[PDB]
Each structure stands twice: as C-alpha cells, then as structure tokens.
Design an enzyme around this catalytic site. Structure first.
Site, mmCIF file in Angstrom:
data_model
loop_
_atom_site.group_PDB
_atom_site.id
_atom_site.type_symbol
_atom_site.label_atom_id
_atom_site.label_comp_id
_atom_site.label_asym_id
_atom_site.label_seq_id
_atom_site.Cartn_x
_atom_site.Cartn_y
_atom_site.Cartn_z
ATOM 1 N N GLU C 75 38.917 24.735 33.121
ATOM 2 C CA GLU C 75 40.007 25.619 33.505
ATOM 3 C C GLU C 75 40.595 25.282 34.868
ATOM 4 O O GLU C 75 41.618 25.872 35.248
ATOM 5 C CB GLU C 75 39.528 27.069 33.477
ATOM 6 C CG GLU C 75 38.978 27.458 32.123
ATOM 7 C CD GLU C 75 38.692 28.929 32.001
ATOM 8 O OE1 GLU C 75 39.528 29.643 31.404
ATOM 9 O OE2 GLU C 75 37.631 29.369 32.495
ATOM 10 N N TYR C 121 47.631 49.518 47.071
ATOM 11 C CA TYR C 121 46.969 48.332 47.603
ATOM 12 C C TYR C 121 47.297 47.065 46.823
ATOM 13 O O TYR C 121 47.435 45.997 47.429
ATOM 14 C CB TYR C 121 45.466 48.600 47.672
ATOM 15 C CG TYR C 121 45.216 49.869 48.448
ATOM 16 C CD1 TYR C 121 45.436 49.904 49.825
ATOM 17 C CD2 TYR C 121 44.830 51.047 47.808
ATOM 18 C CE1 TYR C 121 45.250 51.058 50.549
ATOM 19 C CE2 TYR C 121 44.638 52.216 48.533
ATOM 20 C CZ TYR C 121 44.851 52.212 49.905
ATOM 21 O OH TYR C 121 44.668 53.354 50.651
HETATM 22 ZN ZN ZN Z 1 41.507 53.962 52.289
HETATM 23 ZN ZN ZN Z 2 38.808 31.778 31.372
#
Ligand code: ZN
Ligand code: ZN
Ligand code: CL
Ligand code: CL
Ligand code: CL
Ligand code: CL
Ligand code: ZN
Ligand code: ZN
Lengths: 207, 207, 207, 207
Positions: C75, C121
């Site tokens: 990969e 976030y």
């Molecule tokens: Zn926080």
């Molecule tokens: Zn994979």
C-alpha cells in the site's frame, strides 16, 4: 520453520496479546498448532490465555492421545477434526470474540456463508464462513460438522458459541481471526444503514 | 490451598487486570475472599482496583469486626451477607461493569432470572441471576435481599447498580463475572435482532 | 529536525501505540514518513504495527525504487501518490480503524466531504475528507485518485477500506488520524439522534 | 498534603492512565491542579497525556501569568475561570471522552442538568451538570460561562466539545470524570429502552 521452543513461545505471546486486547475474556478460548512431528500443541484445560505457561502447554496426537503437558482443553477435540481433514491447516484459533459470537447467536444466518462481504480482506484471506448448528458443549456432532466442512472452509462459526479459525501458522490464524472479528464488528456497527456491499464481480476478483 | 500471601497477591493482580481491561473504572468495585481462618480479605474503602496494596487489604470477620488493614469497603457489608448464607461461596467480585450495570437499569427485568440464555456458559457456571431492587447505597435492605438469595443463586444483579458474583475462588468468581459481563454485553449488541435463544431442553442439559 | 534514528524509532513506537489501543488489528495498516534525503521510510510488507523493527523498516524513493530494509508494504504505492502531489505532506498514516472503515462502507457518502462537522477539531486540523471509490486492492486507480486529491485534501477515505491521513510529522498524522477516527466513532454513537451540527458560519471560523 | 514532586508525578501518571485506557486520544485533553502556593500546575500546550514530562509541566498563576515549564495548554484559560469562582476546586480534568463528548453534541439538552440520573453515583459525587453553549475554541465566552457556573456546579459539559470536571484532588477529579463518562456511556448503551430512572425522592436522598 519454527522449533518447539519458538512455537510454545509464540503460543504464550499470542494468547497474552489476545487476552490483553479483549479478544479473549476469562476462561474462554484455546489455541492449537501442528508441531514438526505431526503432533498438536494446544492450550491446556481450564486455562486463561493471558496466563499461559510455555512449559506446560499440552501436546496431543491428532487421534486424541495425550503426550505431554497439562491435559488439553476439551475443545481440542474439534480442533483435531479440522486438522484431520485439511492438510493446509497448521494452527487453529478458537475464541468467543464478541462480535463473531454475537453473529453466531443470530437467527436466519446463511449456513454456507454467514458474512456478506463489504470489505475485501475476509474474502482474500479466509473465504466463505459456514455455520455449525448449536450443540451442547462436548457434543461429538460439533467435531463431526467441522470435519465435514474443513476440506472446503478455512474458518467456521459455531452457532451460539463463537469462531474457529485456521491458518498456515498461529500468527496467520490469529490475523485471520482478528480480520474476521473486525468484519463481524463492522456488521453490528453498520446496523441497518445502507451498506455499499461488494458486487458479485468484486468478490470473484479476490480469489 | 492458597496462603494469605498468595491470596493477598491474587487480589491485587486480579484488581489490576480488571482495571486495565475496563471492567472497573475510577473508585468503583470491590473484591473479597475467604481466608483459611474463616475471616474475609477485602479491598479497602475508597480504593482503586488498579492501585491495590497487598499489605493493606482489609481483613474483617463475617460478622463485621475489622481485623487488619485499611478500613474495608462499605460494600463489604453485603459481601458478608452472601458468605453467611452460602458455604460454597469463597470469593465475591462486585463491579459496576458497563453492560451488567446497563442491564441493571432496565425496566421490566425478570427478578428471578434476568438473563435469557442464548449461550451455554452462564447456565453452566453461574445459573439464574436474580435482581435486587434499587435501594440507596448503604441501605440494609441490600444485604437483606442478598442473604435471602445467596442459598440459591451464585450471582446477583443489584438494580441501578451492578453485579455481585460469587465463586469457589477469586479467579473463578472473576471468570464468572467476565462471562456474565460478556453475556450482558451480547444482549445490547444483539439489540432487537432476532436471536436464536437456547431452547428449554438445551437449558436443562446444562446443569 | 529529527534524524533517521529517531524517525525509525518514532515509527516503531507509534505503531505499537496504535496497535495496543485498537486502531490497528492483525496485519492491517501501514505508516510512512519522509526522510531528510527525500526518500520514504515505511512499514514493511506483511508487518504487524505492534511488532515493528526499527532496523528493518523499508526505505523507498518516491518513484518506487526499493532502497533499504524489508520490502515495503504494497500500500506504500498510494502513499507515494500523496507525497508526489503535496509537498506539505511529511508523513502518512493508513489504518483500517473501525469507525472510519465503517463510514467508508456506507452508501450515499458525500464524495467531497464525508464528515459533516459537529465538533471543531477535524475542521481545524484536517479539513474536508474526500471519498475514493472502492477498487480491488492493488488497483492503480487508487493511487491515481489520491494523486489528484492530494493537493487539496489532507486526509482521504478509501471506500470499503479505510482512512489515509497526512501530517507534517508522523505524530501529527497520527493525531489527525485519531481525531478523525474519534469523529467517525461519534457519528455511529450519535446514530439517529438529533445532532447540534456546527453552523455554516461556525465552520468558516475554523480555517 | 502532597508536595510539588508528588503532584507533578500524579499528573503524569494520571495522564498516562487516561491515555492508555482510551479516555484521551491524540492531542486532546488537559489536566490542572492547585499547587500549595496557590499557583496552577497544568499540562503544557500541544501535549499528549500519555507522554507528559513531570519536569516541564506548566505552572501559571490563576490570573494567567506563566511561571515555569512549557507554555500552558490554551484551554487552561477556562480552567482558571473555575478556580477563580470555586475555592473547593483543587484540580480540573478536561477530556474529550467519547460518550460525554457525544452527549455534548446532542440537541435539546437540559442546560441546567443534562444527565437524568438512573444510577446514584453521579448525584452523590458530582451533582447536576450544566451545559455551556458551543463557541469557537478560544472564545472568552467559554471561560465566562464557566466562571458563572463554577460556584454551583462541580462539572460542566461544553456543548460540541466535552466535559470539564472538578475535584478536591487530581485523582478525585479523575474519578469524577470516569464516573461521569461511564454514566454518559450508559445513556447511549441504554438507548431507547425503557429505563428505571431514579425517582425524585431517590435523587434527594443522595445529597
Ligand atoms: Zn477541549
Ligand atoms: Zn489498507
Ligand atoms: Cl476446557
Ligand atoms: Cl467505599
Ligand atoms: Cl502488504
Ligand atoms: Cl493547546
Ligand atoms: Zn468455545
Ligand atoms: Zn457498587
């Protein structure tokens, strides 16, 4: 080729890794692997996979004769059935891992192929997973079903029980088991959401 | 037969194993086991199962007299009730393990048998699990209910609280607890899917 | 600036941290990071992230030439595609982490932005997450899709597969991956409950 | 009374315990505690709770002046707001723990008491949990809301964010946080099943 030293060692380590990461809880689960002499190394009866002792792991012949170590797990009976009908099987991982056990308690499972693939990895490394009907623990019909399925399937789901997963080594059987459990877990995670299943042609590409 | 050394040791180790693997969080949970002299070894008050000290584990008589170590957990009161009405009980594990606690907050539980079996292992090793009504922590009715149930049941679900699990040793009670929690977890995992429950004859086979 | 010593070291440690905490299971997942000389350090083929060896981690050029260590993960082919079209990318974390993989198997994903933000976030640190269609493992179309997306996106969801997450270092890519997985997990936790999504103005504030 | 040695030590240990057990992932979360001299010990900016260094933990005055160590976490701003309006608060645990964060993203939360009690322990040790509206990270309105709530509440849920939990020590705040997270987790586990909630009289008994 691994020696009995390293094989006993690998079994203890793999047990601890499975126990610490939640794949095995309590007294559940057992491991076996073929030794160079054709005998079976297995985890002993009433054992806890996180507390294995290399020195006392059971050794039994494929015909059931106890050779060294503590008395084998009673479930080694159906471990042997697999070995006796699949020469490619060098190691077996049996766990009550949560999502594969959950899957094993469902009604209406496809008894020839209980995992409908939406990821390629179970198809590539394991293939189809048949389902063994539920039987009282210790029933000879469990081993009988496994012996008949073993020439065509690399893993098996014991209904109301859990998975039995083969491999070309203990680590490969453990990786197969972890891949299967992760796939079973994905089933329950995906739930009733619309899943992009792998097409029929996408499944044939992976063999 | 294990000595007080090993018993104190086993209690610390089992506590750490339960804490690191998520069965106990924070200040919740307590362990007890019968000592050779008939007194009770127990985890102290305000203790954290992952931070136990062998040297300071409480020792109390079954009648409640504090003998050595830190002051016992306040929940040891209903530990003793079990011991006083079941001579087969040598160790008790009390946890707020997530899925058994979840099960304990549900409405409409069967008060005589709250786990409808779809796997054989709780039936074989534990049996039926009664439900104690919810009472304010410290209520004497908790211990009263447990004393009355203890001669017939090896584990108990305190409603809106968590499990109380007996065993012939601390490790066996821990294995029973882990098996129970895994079974409770399977209930919430299976959800409203159609479950292949164990038939009535399949449940009678397991005693 | 980190040396190859510390970079090899960081890769082993980060692998172990991801494996022990469940982000990687079995043989799944791979890590890569840019070395000072512009070559790629990567986890080797058939490797287990909890069992990495600093000394044998693969080194390959961005054009695919194998330089030192064990043969790279297969990969790493699509790792390189990202590096070759994003000079800000210094490290890539590829995992089959459970909830991001689950999200990747769903039907009807927004292919340009599969995570509808309800926490700030992922927006601040990652941005939008495109979806690559499912292709047989090893298909060059995987790397092709990633090369085309890499100049505009810092992470990518391979359908029926899992996440590919970039960062300015391996630890930052790991933190991005952990933040993404936690956000994907929140999706499945929140389920069909009514979610207080971030408003359009609240999302624009975070860039 | 604990010394700065042990307090710095406790903070590192508690961080590692929270990180290894999944309460904190990646770069998320911060800890603070009052030192004997009235200053604040806090985890530094861009820190990972599993990789804290006792020697470099930040020390800041309650009015925001940086005293020793690495620069404090930016979220210590709203830690201080709590200390400045609750003299009983000696330590604060802020996490993005999964189920409390999930609960924080829901619509229709009771802003004065977001946890409807079905277990006694959050009532006994924490009390009601108010909800702070979502604001861009770094918004002074976050600290403003906390300062106004701090005299009456021992823990706070920042919407679309996570919990902020006080205690009489760092370990007690951590135990409060773990109890809260377990209670939030029970909410999502119980789902739409009929719950035996604690009666109004049962809740008044626990104060
Ligand atoms: Zn926080
Ligand atoms: Zn994979
Ligand atoms: Cl056995
Ligand atoms: Cl107590
Ligand atoms: Cl590979
Ligand atoms: Cl920060
Ligand atoms: Zn079994
Ligand atoms: Zn309790």
């Amino acid at each position: 080729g691994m020696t009995e030293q390293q094989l006993r060692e690998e079994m203890v380590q793999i047990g601890a890794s499975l126990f610490s990461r939640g794949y095995a809880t309590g007294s559940a689960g057992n491991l076996s692997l073929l030794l160079p002499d054709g005998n079976l190394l297995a985890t002993p009866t009433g054992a806890c996979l996180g507390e294995l002792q290399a020195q006392r792991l059971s050794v039994v012949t494929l015909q059931g004769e106890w050779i060294s170590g503590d008395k084998p797990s009673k479930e080694v009976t159906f471990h042997r059935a697999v070995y006796l009908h699949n020469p490619a099987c060098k190691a077996i991982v049996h766990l009550h891992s949560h999502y594969l056990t959950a899957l094993s308690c469902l009604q209406g499972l496809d008894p020839h192929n209980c995992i409908r693939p939406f990821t390629p990895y179970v198809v590539m490394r394991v293939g189809d997973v048949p389902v063994v009907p539920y039987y009282r623990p210790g029933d000879d019909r469990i081993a009988q079903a496994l012996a008949g399925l073993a020439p065509r399937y690399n893993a098996f789901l014991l209904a109301n029980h859990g998975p039995v997963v083969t491999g070309s080594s203990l680590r490969e059987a453990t990786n197969n088991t972890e891949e299967l459990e992760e796939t079973a877990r994905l089933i329950f995670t995906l739930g009733n959401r619309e899943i992009r299943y792998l097409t029929a042609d996408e499944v044939k590409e992976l063999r």
